[PDB]
RNA sequence: AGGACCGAACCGACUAAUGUCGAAAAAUUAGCGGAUGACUUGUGGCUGGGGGUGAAAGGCCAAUCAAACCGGGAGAUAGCU
RNA sequence: GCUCGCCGGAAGACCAAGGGUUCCUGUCCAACGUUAAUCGGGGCAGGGUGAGUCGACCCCUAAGGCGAGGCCGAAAGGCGUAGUCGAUGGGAAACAGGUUAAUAUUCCUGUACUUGGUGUUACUGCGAAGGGGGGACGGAGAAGGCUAUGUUGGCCGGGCGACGGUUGUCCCGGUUUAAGCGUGUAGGCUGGUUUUCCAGGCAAAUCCGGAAAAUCAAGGCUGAGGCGUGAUGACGAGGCACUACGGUGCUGAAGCAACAAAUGCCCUGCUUCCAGGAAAAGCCUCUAAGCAUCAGGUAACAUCAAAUCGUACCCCAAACCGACACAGGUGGUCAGGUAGAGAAUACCAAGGCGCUUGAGAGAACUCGGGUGAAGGAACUAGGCAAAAUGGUGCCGUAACUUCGGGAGAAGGCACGCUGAUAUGUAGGUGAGGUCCCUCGCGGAUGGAGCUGAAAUCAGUCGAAGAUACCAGCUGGCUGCAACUGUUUAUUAAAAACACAGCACUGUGCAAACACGAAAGUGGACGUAUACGGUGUGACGCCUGCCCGGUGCCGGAAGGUUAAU
RNA sequence: AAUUCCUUGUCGGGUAAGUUCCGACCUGCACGAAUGGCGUAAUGAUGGCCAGGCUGUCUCCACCCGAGACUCAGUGAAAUUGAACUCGCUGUGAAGAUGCAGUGUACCCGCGGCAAGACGGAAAGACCCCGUGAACCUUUACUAUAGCUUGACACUGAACA
RNA sequence: CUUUAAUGUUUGAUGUUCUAACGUUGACCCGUAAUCCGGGUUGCGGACAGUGUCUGGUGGGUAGUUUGACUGGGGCGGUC
RNA sequence: CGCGGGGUGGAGCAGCCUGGUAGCUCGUCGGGCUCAUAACCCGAAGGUCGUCGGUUCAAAUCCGGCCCCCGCAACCA
């Protein structure tokens, strides 16, 4: 839920916690874990690749199965589990065979419901099957570009892909950005909008709210010296230069799209 | 005050030591020069 | 519960005197500010000279920084003293 | 040696680090000590560091380093897989007493424990770089039961005391005991067991996981401390005995109850919240390729082994770092008594010291301070410095507001001691006795003893009762910044920076962007409620007009236009 | 007004006295709606003003207690320094004289003190200027260049509309 | 000569299809317990992309320098 | 102290640059449409081109004095 915290102190004056009263308050299932020593945003040769990184609490990378490589096997959702490595919250689901897996819990999926992966998976959010079997006009997520990687599009909380058409071997998918890309029809997608869609309502208030996330303080350009930044400098506090990046790139207006080996796939440009 | 030299052998030997020198190309360049002037304490040790 | 209130160990350094060839190549004394937090810290690593790091002062990188130190260009050049 | 005085959550007692004989003993005084010096951290010489249980080496990992082939790069070399290294991490096992001029959880006496090898006897199937469980973990808060430890009392031993009382409700000293084992409480966790079946665990599987049955309600795991044992042992005050007059030998009374109570332990707990909280090995266990007159494993017993290195001393300082015997900086454990909420602080205990120049003088002047008539900021750049306010409970408390605050607003009343309510109350804890019992570290009940706020009343002492140390100045207007915070270390700590929030814009993932001549990486093992760039900077009301110039984006018909 | 040159603007309030401050008048040299405008509870070792309180800050300081200063015994530096038997005044002079001329005055030598001068001492002025010096930084100063981007060629071929 | 028309012939620019070049930070297997990689199958794209040579444009992100003198001190101004 | 541009009917601008011919909207006077004005339609007049001198087949034009206006300047320790 979107808990509007009562103002006790100037700091708790603007903090809103996204607390779902269905989360397993106990420690999670071990066998699907893996540590993840944060990198601090450094390359193999040690130099910082990007700022605003490094810090926060220790996080455990839980091995979530996005791949969904099981066919015609029913399952039962045991409990909605929390995971720090994602905006949304994963779900500990158990099959009939004896394998417990983590997935992306969809909108209307409570602990106790049934799901199934495979081409025989009838309609019910959370089921994994090819898109040519999926009725057009529906809502899907965790979609790939080629069968065999896991699912990329519509992955974070509240994201959904709306299947437009199925022109031959290529399916038409209206992504969240308005950008449409054709995907091979043999691709697998899981049905339903991803749940826990309240993360955009999350307001921090605390400066540390980003500090224990791992995000470092973000400075501005109108303060530095020209030797370390294209911006900066000034006695009367000047700005005077056309809005650029620390690398002279004409920002605030400049589409940097340049791949060409994949430009045969943008149906409509991002409006 | 907090003076700029709080000694610690472990850090020292691993950053100036014999093996810490011999491990690089430019390292043998040093061993060459230290013997070039015939010095005795080429690297810090016992 | 709280980047919540007072205030020690701890950390810092706003005001003033003493000191300025000093006790000391930035300290003591008397009051101060935070002190469960964006906290402090021991140990052990990674990132480096036109590069590193930066809650951005052109501060810091061994008392030395609008470009550290050592040696080699180089006995540089000097209409200057 | 007798006093004085100092600190006493330290200027104390021990370790890591880093030094390197600075430790102890004898001898010596030129040089070192800011002085003298028969003294010493100085010279010369001798001695001293004793480990299966301490740490490490060792086993196995993190960040990360290196890195056979491999990928790539003029060369050098860069990255990185398999592996191999790397603690501040996890992993086996010991304490007391005594002794030395100097070292001892190491030596000696006593009492225990651990991992392996060979052998003996009786049984049984064992066996991986492969799997599972365990290891294995977050912040904060509050509670219950105890311990380290202290106090009073009882008892024992001594004294009854150089100026008045002192055989008494008087005074002083002691009243100490671990590791392990047995029991296995308070407490916490969890439904066990039996049968069958199964696309699961790269294969197998009796181990784990799952789905249905079955019987019964507990079994099991874990667990500080107490209690016995350890221990008719050790230690122990004071005597008894010889003095090289430094100390040694001998002997040895009492050795418990009650209350108070930790930041120590149970707790690697519990409730709860959010930022969502290592890894591997040791260990238990299942089996593959296989091997079964075997090899090995389980249990009991005898015996052997437990190597190497560190081990002295300093360790909040004259031995570390600061050129110095330097008013500075330096992590962790232990940390008594009274008052006090407290590790503040004051005075003392244990213990260690008086700081390695002093003796006279008491002028100006300088510094650290006390007090001061009358006025009380007239000082001055300015209430800077000093002064004063300063503690507990209760009463009372405006403008304004985002209805949390403002606020401990301002401003006030009572505070000592003694007696009484009551031969010290409410409260806390709690033996004996009694009963019961699925008999143990039991449950109710019962009340001796011990410990111990506060409120009221009466009386009395002084000028003053938070009487000392310690310990807020307050009210009002207003500029700016939201707030905590961060920064010019070594002249600027703010209005600067950050901040959460908001807005624009780039990115559809081999993503942009960024380091890198490349590979490879971060971004992210995230993917649009997302990630990077830029601007402003909580919240509230809003955020107009201009597309000329510059830049950017979109469209390209035409003019012009490089190489070919 | 952290912004208003002029200026101590004008008016009202606060004081006996207000270049500051508070609230307004708009004549805004030269505020302005994200290099955000106007407010804003709380917070503030923040800037400015005022009141009460309290005091030696002040009227004007006074005494006393300690640590130095003064003395003795021991130890024993330092910046600096051309050479010295090293007075004031008037004037002159590389233009402010301890040293030259005239003149007044002054026994020789120490201690304790205070600081006007010796253009005292420390820093080959950090300010102005110069060097056809340097150093970074800016951009519609000149020329190149990383990177991005366009096209031709090569790796790169087969067929038809 | 201009306008035009069928064809032979010589080249170019687009559209589409295809697979061998190539790419593949897709699946899977083996080397091999090994997320590098190589190769083998298959799938998906496709003569694109990417790299080299030459070239136009942009380009203070990076680099090397310039930035006058006389001047009753400089600067502004003025002048040569 | 200086530099650049400008000064044209009642108001404001053209023409100048590259030398003969002086234009536009409104306004002033009058007529007309309406009952009146405005507005609107139509015509004419209105300009020593700030001033004088010089020179040129033409002076508003090219140039030199004097007066007036706008911006910057009143500077560095």
mmCIF file of N, CA, C and O (backbone and C1' of nucleotides) in Angstrom, chain G residues 21-60:
data_model
loop_
_atom_site.group_PDB
_atom_site.id
_atom_site.type_symbol
_atom_site.label_atom_id
_atom_site.label_comp_id
_atom_site.label_asym_id
_atom_site.label_seq_id
_atom_site.Cartn_x
_atom_site.Cartn_y
_atom_site.Cartn_z
ATOM 1 P P U G 21 16.413 69.377 -58.838
ATOM 2 O "O5'" U G 21 15.158 68.874 -59.684
ATOM 3 C "C5'" U G 21 13.927 68.495 -59.034
ATOM 4 C "C4'" U G 21 13.014 67.782 -60.004
ATOM 5 C "C3'" U G 21 11.851 67.038 -59.363
ATOM 6 O "O3'" U G 21 10.743 67.905 -59.125
ATOM 7 C "C1'" U G 21 12.915 65.640 -60.953
ATOM 8 P P A G 22 10.501 68.524 -57.656
ATOM 9 O "O5'" A G 22 9.672 67.408 -56.875
ATOM 10 C "C5'" A G 22 10.179 66.067 -56.720
ATOM 11 C "C4'" A G 22 10.353 65.735 -55.253
ATOM 12 C "C3'" A G 22 9.183 66.053 -54.338
ATOM 13 O "O3'" A G 22 8.166 65.059 -54.401
ATOM 14 C "C1'" A G 22 11.198 66.737 -53.308
ATOM 15 P P G G 23 6.625 65.483 -54.226
ATOM 16 O "O5'" G G 23 5.929 64.150 -53.701
ATOM 17 C "C5'" G G 23 5.989 62.935 -54.473
ATOM 18 C "C4'" G G 23 6.092 61.735 -53.559
ATOM 19 C "C3'" G G 23 5.013 61.610 -52.494
ATOM 20 O "O3'" G G 23 3.805 61.059 -53.012
ATOM 21 C "C1'" G G 23 7.126 61.215 -51.516
ATOM 22 P P C G 24 2.420 61.289 -52.223
ATOM 23 O "O5'" C G 24 2.559 60.370 -50.927
ATOM 24 C "C5'" C G 24 2.613 58.933 -51.043
ATOM 25 C "C4'" C G 24 2.682 58.291 -49.674
ATOM 26 C "C3'" C G 24 1.614 58.714 -48.676
ATOM 27 O "O3'" C G 24 0.385 58.026 -48.907
ATOM 28 C "C1'" C G 24 3.729 58.688 -47.612
ATOM 29 P P U G 25 -1.012 58.721 -48.509
ATOM 30 O "O5'" U G 25 -1.135 58.460 -46.941
ATOM 31 C "C5'" U G 25 -1.476 57.154 -46.428
ATOM 32 C "C4'" U G 25 -1.392 57.140 -44.919
ATOM 33 C "C3'" U G 25 -2.197 58.212 -44.197
ATOM 34 O "O3'" U G 25 -3.570 57.842 -44.072
ATOM 35 C "C1'" U G 25 -0.022 58.102 -43.273
ATOM 36 P P C G 26 -4.714 58.979 -44.110
ATOM 37 O "O5'" C G 26 -4.536 59.750 -42.726
ATOM 38 C "C5'" C G 26 -4.775 59.080 -41.472
ATOM 39 C "C4'" C G 26 -4.165 59.855 -40.325
ATOM 40 C "C3'" C G 26 -4.655 61.281 -40.122
ATOM 41 O "O3'" C G 26 -5.895 61.332 -39.417
ATOM 42 C "C1'" C G 26 -2.299 61.238 -39.975
ATOM 43 P P G G 27 -6.918 62.547 -39.679
ATOM 44 O "O5'" G G 27 -6.099 63.854 -39.267
ATOM 45 C "C5'" G G 27 -5.643 64.046 -37.909
ATOM 46 C "C4'" G G 27 -4.709 65.236 -37.824
ATOM 47 C "C3'" G G 27 -5.279 66.579 -38.256
ATOM 48 O "O3'" G G 27 -6.019 67.188 -37.197
ATOM 49 C "C1'" G G 27 -3.142 66.275 -39.229
ATOM 50 P P U G 28 -7.212 68.216 -37.535
ATOM 51 O "O5'" U G 28 -6.499 69.396 -38.338
ATOM 52 C "C5'" U G 28 -5.834 70.474 -37.643
ATOM 53 C "C4'" U G 28 -5.628 71.652 -38.570
ATOM 54 C "C3'" U G 28 -6.870 72.136 -39.300
ATOM 55 O "O3'" U G 28 -7.665 72.989 -38.480
ATOM 56 C "C1'" U G 28 -5.085 71.944 -40.838
ATOM 57 P P C G 29 -9.260 73.039 -38.690
ATOM 58 O "O5'" C G 29 -9.430 73.622 -40.164
ATOM 59 C "C5'" C G 29 -9.121 75.001 -40.454
ATOM 60 C "C4'" C G 29 -9.426 75.324 -41.901
ATOM 61 C "C3'" C G 29 -10.784 74.880 -42.420
ATOM 62 O "O3'" C G 29 -11.834 75.752 -42.012
ATOM 63 C "C1'" C G 29 -9.127 74.353 -44.018
ATOM 64 P P G G 30 -13.311 75.160 -41.769
ATOM 65 O "O5'" G G 30 -13.793 74.728 -43.226
ATOM 66 C "C5'" G G 30 -13.978 75.710 -44.263
ATOM 67 C "C4'" G G 30 -14.250 75.039 -45.594
ATOM 68 C "C3'" G G 30 -15.392 74.035 -45.638
ATOM 69 O "O3'" G G 30 -16.666 74.679 -45.721
ATOM 70 C "C1'" G G 30 -13.530 73.174 -46.820
ATOM 71 P P G G 31 -17.999 73.881 -45.286
ATOM 72 O "O5'" G G 31 -18.261 72.880 -46.500
ATOM 73 C "C5'" G G 31 -18.519 73.376 -47.832
ATOM 74 C "C4'" G G 31 -18.569 72.233 -48.826
ATOM 75 C "C3'" G G 31 -19.534 71.099 -48.513
ATOM 76 O "O3'" G G 31 -20.866 71.426 -48.908
ATOM 77 C "C1'" G G 31 -17.449 70.201 -49.180
ATOM 78 P P G G 32 -22.118 70.855 -48.069
ATOM 79 O "O5'" G G 32 -22.123 69.294 -48.395
ATOM 80 C "C5'" G G 32 -22.293 68.825 -49.748
ATOM 81 C "C4'" G G 32 -21.926 67.361 -49.852
ATOM 82 C "C3'" G G 32 -22.693 66.401 -48.959
ATOM 83 O "O3'" G G 32 -23.965 66.081 -49.525
ATOM 84 C "C1'" G G 32 -20.386 65.870 -48.906
ATOM 85 P P C G 33 -25.203 65.707 -48.565
ATOM 86 O "O5'" C G 33 -24.823 64.273 -47.977
ATOM 87 C "C5'" C G 33 -24.990 63.075 -48.767
ATOM 88 C "C4'" C G 33 -24.737 61.844 -47.927
ATOM 89 C "C3'" C G 33 -25.517 61.760 -46.625
ATOM 90 O "O3'" C G 33 -26.838 61.277 -46.845
ATOM 91 C "C1'" C G 33 -23.254 61.193 -46.233
ATOM 92 P P U G 34 -28.087 62.037 -46.175
ATOM 93 O "O5'" U G 34 -27.858 61.848 -44.609
ATOM 94 C "C5'" U G 34 -28.137 60.586 -43.968
ATOM 95 C "C4'" U G 34 -27.923 60.685 -42.472
ATOM 96 C "C3'" U G 34 -28.559 61.877 -41.774
ATOM 97 O "O3'" U G 34 -29.952 61.681 -41.545
ATOM 98 C "C1'" U G 34 -26.365 61.550 -40.950
ATOM 99 P P C G 35 -30.982 62.895 -41.787
ATOM 100 O "O5'" C G 35 -30.397 64.085 -40.899
ATOM 101 C "C5'" C G 35 -30.925 65.425 -41.009
ATOM 102 C "C4'" C G 35 -30.731 66.175 -39.708
ATOM 103 C "C3'" C G 35 -29.299 66.273 -39.203
ATOM 104 O "O3'" C G 35 -28.594 67.349 -39.827
ATOM 105 C "C1'" C G 35 -30.702 65.586 -37.433
ATOM 106 P P A G 36 -26.983 67.361 -39.829
ATOM 107 O "O5'" A G 36 -26.586 67.525 -38.294
ATOM 108 C "C5'" A G 36 -26.297 68.821 -37.723
ATOM 109 C "C4'" A G 36 -25.389 68.667 -36.522
ATOM 110 C "C3'" A G 36 -24.059 67.979 -36.801
ATOM 111 O "O3'" A G 36 -23.075 68.894 -37.284
ATOM 112 C "C1'" A G 36 -25.089 66.949 -34.943
ATOM 113 P P U G 37 -21.894 68.372 -38.247
ATOM 114 O "O5'" U G 37 -20.887 67.630 -37.259
ATOM 115 C "C5'" U G 37 -20.157 68.368 -36.254
ATOM 116 C "C4'" U G 37 -19.537 67.423 -35.246
ATOM 117 C "C3'" U G 37 -18.554 66.395 -35.787
ATOM 118 O "O3'" U G 37 -17.251 66.945 -35.974
ATOM 119 C "C1'" U G 37 -20.059 65.333 -34.306
ATOM 120 P P A G 38 -16.250 66.287 -37.052
ATOM 121 O "O5'" A G 38 -16.003 64.807 -36.505
ATOM 122 C "C5'" A G 38 -15.327 64.585 -35.250
ATOM 123 C "C4'" A G 38 -15.376 63.119 -34.871
ATOM 124 C "C3'" A G 38 -14.762 62.139 -35.860
ATOM 125 O "O3'" A G 38 -13.348 62.057 -35.692
ATOM 126 C "C1'" A G 38 -16.862 61.324 -35.128
ATOM 127 P P A G 39 -12.395 61.846 -36.971
ATOM 128 O "O5'" A G 39 -12.880 60.460 -37.595
ATOM 129 C "C5'" A G 39 -12.671 59.208 -36.901
ATOM 130 C "C4'" A G 39 -13.453 58.100 -37.570
ATOM 131 C "C3'" A G 39 -13.187 57.922 -39.058
ATOM 132 O "O3'" A G 39 -12.032 57.121 -39.294
ATOM 133 C "C1'" A G 39 -15.518 57.998 -38.689
ATOM 134 P P C G 40 -11.055 57.463 -40.525
ATOM 135 O "O5'" C G 40 -11.988 57.316 -41.812
ATOM 136 C "C5'" C G 40 -12.517 56.031 -42.199
ATOM 137 C "C4'" C G 40 -13.516 56.185 -43.326
ATOM 138 C "C3'" C G 40 -13.012 56.913 -44.563
ATOM 139 O "O3'" C G 40 -12.270 56.043 -45.414
ATOM 140 C "C1'" C G 40 -15.130 57.772 -43.958
ATOM 141 P P C G 41 -11.120 56.641 -46.368
ATOM 142 O "O5'" C G 41 -11.926 57.388 -47.523
ATOM 143 C "C5'" C G 41 -12.675 56.641 -48.506
ATOM 144 C "C4'" C G 41 -13.432 57.578 -49.420
ATOM 145 C "C3'" C G 41 -12.604 58.653 -50.106
ATOM 146 O "O3'" C G 41 -11.944 58.150 -51.267
ATOM 147 C "C1'" C G 41 -14.558 59.626 -49.199
ATOM 148 P P C G 42 -10.540 58.786 -51.732
ATOM 149 O "O5'" C G 42 -10.920 60.262 -52.204
ATOM 150 C "C5'" C G 42 -11.632 60.485 -53.441
ATOM 151 C "C4'" C G 42 -11.824 61.969 -53.685
ATOM 152 C "C3'" C G 42 -10.575 62.832 -53.613
ATOM 153 O "O3'" C G 42 -9.811 62.773 -54.813
ATOM 154 C "C1'" C G 42 -12.310 63.878 -52.404
ATOM 155 P P G G 43 -8.244 63.139 -54.782
ATOM 156 O "O5'" G G 43 -8.221 64.732 -54.707
ATOM 157 C "C5'" G G 43 -8.670 65.536 -55.822
ATOM 158 C "C4'" G G 43 -8.665 67.006 -55.457
ATOM 159 C "C3'" G G 43 -7.347 67.575 -54.952
ATOM 160 O "O3'" G G 43 -6.474 67.901 -56.034
ATOM 161 C "C1'" G G 43 -9.108 68.291 -53.543
ATOM 162 P P A G 44 -4.886 67.996 -55.783
ATOM 163 O "O5'" A G 44 -4.692 69.421 -55.096
ATOM 164 C "C5'" A G 44 -5.029 70.636 -55.800
ATOM 165 C "C4'" A G 44 -5.026 71.815 -54.852
ATOM 166 C "C3'" A G 44 -3.737 72.054 -54.080
ATOM 167 O "O3'" A G 44 -2.784 72.770 -54.863
ATOM 168 C "C1'" A G 44 -5.570 72.161 -52.594
ATOM 169 P P A G 45 -1.215 72.642 -54.530
ATOM 170 O "O5'" A G 45 -1.032 73.526 -53.217
ATOM 171 C "C5'" A G 45 -1.377 74.925 -53.213
ATOM 172 C "C4'" A G 45 -1.459 75.443 -51.796
ATOM 173 C "C3'" A G 45 -0.207 75.257 -50.953
ATOM 174 O "O3'" A G 45 0.740 76.297 -51.193
ATOM 175 C "C1'" A G 45 -2.090 74.539 -49.721
ATOM 176 P P G G 46 2.313 75.993 -51.052
ATOM 177 O "O5'" G G 46 2.496 75.608 -49.516
ATOM 178 C "C5'" G G 46 2.149 76.541 -48.471
ATOM 179 C "C4'" G G 46 2.179 75.856 -47.123
ATOM 180 C "C3'" G G 46 3.475 75.144 -46.776
ATOM 181 O "O3'" G G 46 4.445 76.059 -46.275
ATOM 182 C "C1'" G G 46 1.645 73.732 -46.281
ATOM 183 P P G G 47 5.837 76.254 -47.056
ATOM 184 O "O5'" G G 47 6.653 74.923 -46.735
ATOM 185 C "C5'" G G 47 7.158 74.664 -45.412
ATOM 186 C "C4'" G G 47 8.402 73.803 -45.478
ATOM 187 C "C3'" G G 47 9.504 74.274 -46.414
ATOM 188 O "O3'" G G 47 10.283 75.298 -45.804
ATOM 189 C "C1'" G G 47 9.191 71.937 -46.647
ATOM 190 P P U G 48 10.443 76.724 -46.529
ATOM 191 O "O5'" U G 48 11.663 76.519 -47.537
ATOM 192 C "C5'" U G 48 12.957 76.100 -47.063
ATOM 193 C "C4'" U G 48 13.953 77.228 -47.198
ATOM 194 C "C3'" U G 48 15.331 76.957 -46.614
ATOM 195 O "O3'" U G 48 16.152 76.268 -47.557
ATOM 196 C "C1'" U G 48 14.569 79.079 -45.892
ATOM 197 P P C G 49 17.116 75.076 -47.068
ATOM 198 O "O5'" C G 49 16.119 73.904 -46.652
ATOM 199 C "C5'" C G 49 15.470 73.890 -45.365
ATOM 200 C "C4'" C G 49 15.506 72.494 -44.780
ATOM 201 C "C3'" C G 49 16.895 71.902 -44.554
ATOM 202 O "O3'" C G 49 16.856 71.033 -43.424
ATOM 203 C "C1'" C G 49 15.720 70.572 -46.113
ATOM 204 P P G G 50 18.074 71.028 -42.374
ATOM 205 O "O5'" G G 50 18.059 72.488 -41.732
ATOM 206 C "C5'" G G 50 16.915 72.966 -40.992
ATOM 207 C "C4'" G G 50 17.360 73.888 -39.876
ATOM 208 C "C3'" G G 50 18.265 75.041 -40.284
ATOM 209 O "O3'" G G 50 17.507 76.133 -40.796
ATOM 210 C "C1'" G G 50 19.135 74.000 -38.345
ATOM 211 P P U G 51 17.912 76.804 -42.200
ATOM 212 O "O5'" U G 51 19.259 77.596 -41.889
ATOM 213 C "C5'" U G 51 19.247 78.814 -41.116
ATOM 214 C "C4'" U G 51 20.660 79.304 -40.892
ATOM 215 C "C3'" U G 51 21.474 79.577 -42.149
ATOM 216 O "O3'" U G 51 21.208 80.875 -42.681
ATOM 217 C "C1'" U G 51 22.753 78.255 -40.664
ATOM 218 P P C G 52 21.448 81.168 -44.247
ATOM 219 O "O5'" C G 52 23.023 81.400 -44.360
ATOM 220 C "C5'" C G 52 23.635 82.587 -43.813
ATOM 221 C "C4'" C G 52 25.141 82.435 -43.752
ATOM 222 C "C3'" C G 52 25.859 82.170 -45.067
ATOM 223 O "O3'" C G 52 26.075 83.373 -45.803
ATOM 224 C "C1'" C G 52 26.687 80.701 -43.407
ATOM 225 P P G G 53 26.331 83.307 -47.391
ATOM 226 O "O5'" G G 53 27.792 82.678 -47.527
ATOM 227 C "C5'" G G 53 28.964 83.438 -47.153
ATOM 228 C "C4'" G G 53 30.190 82.549 -47.107
ATOM 229 C "C3'" G G 53 30.565 81.811 -48.386
ATOM 230 O "O3'" G G 53 31.281 82.648 -49.293
ATOM 231 C "C1'" G G 53 30.699 80.325 -46.553
ATOM 232 P P G G 54 31.289 82.304 -50.866
ATOM 233 O "O5'" G G 54 32.171 80.978 -50.975
ATOM 234 C "C5'" G G 54 33.570 80.984 -50.619
ATOM 235 C "C4'" G G 54 34.136 79.579 -50.666
ATOM 236 C "C3'" G G 54 34.021 78.849 -51.997
ATOM 237 O "O3'" G G 54 35.087 79.220 -52.873
ATOM 238 C "C1'" G G 54 33.364 77.407 -50.235
ATOM 239 P P U G 55 34.785 79.529 -54.425
ATOM 240 O "O5'" U G 55 34.549 78.091 -55.071
ATOM 241 C "C5'" U G 55 35.628 77.136 -55.175
ATOM 242 C "C4'" U G 55 35.077 75.748 -55.424
ATOM 243 C "C3'" U G 55 34.230 75.588 -56.679
ATOM 244 O "O3'" U G 55 35.035 75.364 -57.839
ATOM 245 C "C1'" U G 55 33.091 74.634 -54.839
ATOM 246 P P U G 56 34.450 75.699 -59.303
ATOM 247 O "O5'" U G 56 33.322 74.593 -59.534
ATOM 248 C "C5'" U G 56 33.677 73.211 -59.749
ATOM 249 C "C4'" U G 56 32.438 72.337 -59.799
ATOM 250 C "C3'" U G 56 31.391 72.699 -60.841
ATOM 251 O "O3'" U G 56 31.774 72.237 -62.133
ATOM 252 C "C1'" U G 56 30.338 72.108 -58.800
ATOM 253 P P C G 57 31.288 73.031 -63.445
ATOM 254 O "O5'" C G 57 29.711 72.803 -63.475
ATOM 255 C "C5'" C G 57 29.029 72.511 -64.714
ATOM 256 C "C4'" C G 57 27.886 73.474 -64.921
ATOM 257 C "C3'" C G 57 26.744 73.335 -63.926
ATOM 258 O "O3'" C G 57 27.067 74.037 -62.724
ATOM 259 C "C1'" C G 57 25.911 73.686 -66.132
ATOM 260 P P A G 58 26.358 73.641 -61.335
ATOM 261 O "O5'" A G 58 25.074 74.587 -61.266
ATOM 262 C "C5'" A G 58 24.426 74.852 -60.004
ATOM 263 C "C4'" A G 58 23.035 74.263 -59.998
ATOM 264 C "C3'" A G 58 22.539 73.823 -58.625
ATOM 265 O "O3'" A G 58 21.880 74.890 -57.941
ATOM 266 C "C1'" A G 58 22.252 72.067 -60.192
ATOM 267 P P A G 59 22.502 75.492 -56.583
ATOM 268 O "O5'" A G 59 22.624 74.249 -55.592
ATOM 269 C "C5'" A G 59 21.506 73.369 -55.363
ATOM 270 C "C4'" A G 59 21.630 72.690 -54.014
ATOM 271 C "C3'" A G 59 21.621 73.588 -52.778
ATOM 272 O "O3'" A G 59 21.032 72.859 -51.707
ATOM 273 C "C1'" A G 59 23.625 72.367 -52.830
ATOM 274 P P A G 60 19.776 73.468 -50.917
ATOM 275 O "O5'" A G 60 19.142 72.191 -50.200
ATOM 276 C "C5'" A G 60 19.351 71.931 -48.795
ATOM 277 C "C4'" A G 60 19.414 70.441 -48.539
ATOM 278 C "C3'" A G 60 20.599 69.706 -49.150
ATOM 279 O "O3'" A G 60 21.756 69.795 -48.318
ATOM 280 C "C1'" A G 60 18.614 68.526 -49.641
#
